[PDB]
């Protein structure tokens, strides 16, 4: 599923993402925008280390979910990576919450640093009623 901007903003707020571990909703929106373009089925193979990024937040198979083919990987979210490709984003949100529970927080995603950090991210949530 490819979510529309405000549709996604409203869903995330309902899922308790606004202010989660100090992270505003607009930041989560900026991350989803740059990682997948709000697309839940997005997958990206990293030829360099044999891992794959899954779903709306492009969560990596090396530390977060299990896809069985990634070398020396863990499954911290305790989920099959398939769970991160559903139209229902409940599991992906639960896993994203787990990711930011580590010291790096939202910085764990390089895209966030490149395109969201220190920028005016208000545009991502404007007019959505959140
Ligand atoms: Na894994």
From Swiss-Prot:
Q: What is its main location?
A: secreted
Stored SUPFAM superfamilies: Lysozyme-like
Specify the domain of life of the species encoding this protein: Eukaryota
Its Enzyme Commission number(s) read 3.2.1.17
Q: Which GO terms describe its cellular component?
A: azurophil granule lumen; extracellular exosome; extracellular region; extracellular space; specific granule lumen; tertiary granule lumen
Q: Which GO molecular-function terms appear in the entry?
A: identical protein binding; lysozyme activity
C-type lysozyme domain location is: 1-130
Which controlled-vocabulary keywords does the entry list? Amyloid, Amyloidosis, Antimicrobial, Bacteriolytic enzyme, Disease variant, Disulfide bond, Glycosidase, Hydrolase, Secreted, Signal
Question: What reaction gets catalysed by this protein?
Answer: Hydrolysis of (1->4)-beta-linkages between N-acetylmuramic acid and N-acetyl-D-glucosamine residues in a peptidoglycan and between N-acetyl-D-glucosamine residues in chitodextrins
Q: Where in the cell is it found?
A: Secreted
Q: Does the keyword Secreted apply?
A: yes
Q: Name one GO biological process term.
A: defense response to Gram-negative bacterium
Other remarks on record?
Lysozyme C is capable of both hydrolysis and transglycosylation; it also shows a slight esterase activity. It acts rapidly on both peptide-substituted and unsubstituted peptidoglycan, and slowly on chitin oligosaccharides.
Q: Which family does it belong to?
A: Belongs to the glycosyl hydrolase 22 family.
Q: How does it assemble?
A: Monomer.
Q: Could you tell me what this protein is called? A: Lysozyme C
- Which organism is the protein's source? Homo sapiens (Human)
């Amino acid at each position: 599923k490819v979510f529309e901007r405000c549709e996604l903003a409203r869903a995330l707020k309902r899922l308790g993402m606004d202010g989660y571990r100090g992270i505003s909703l607009a930041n989560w929106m900026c991350l989803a925008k740059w990682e997948s373009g709000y697309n839940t089925r997005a997958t990206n193979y990293n030829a360099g280390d044999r891992s794959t990024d899954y779903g709306i937040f492009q969560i990596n198979s090396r530390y977060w979910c299990n896809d069985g083919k990634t070398p020396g990987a863990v499954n911290a979210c305790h989920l099959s990576c398939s769970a991160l490709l559903q139209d229902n984003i409940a599991d992906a949100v639960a896993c994203a919450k787990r990711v930011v529970r580590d010291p790096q927080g939202i910085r764990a995603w390089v895209a966030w640093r490149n395109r969201c950090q220190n920028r005016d991210v208000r545009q991502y949530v404007q007019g959505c009623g959140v």
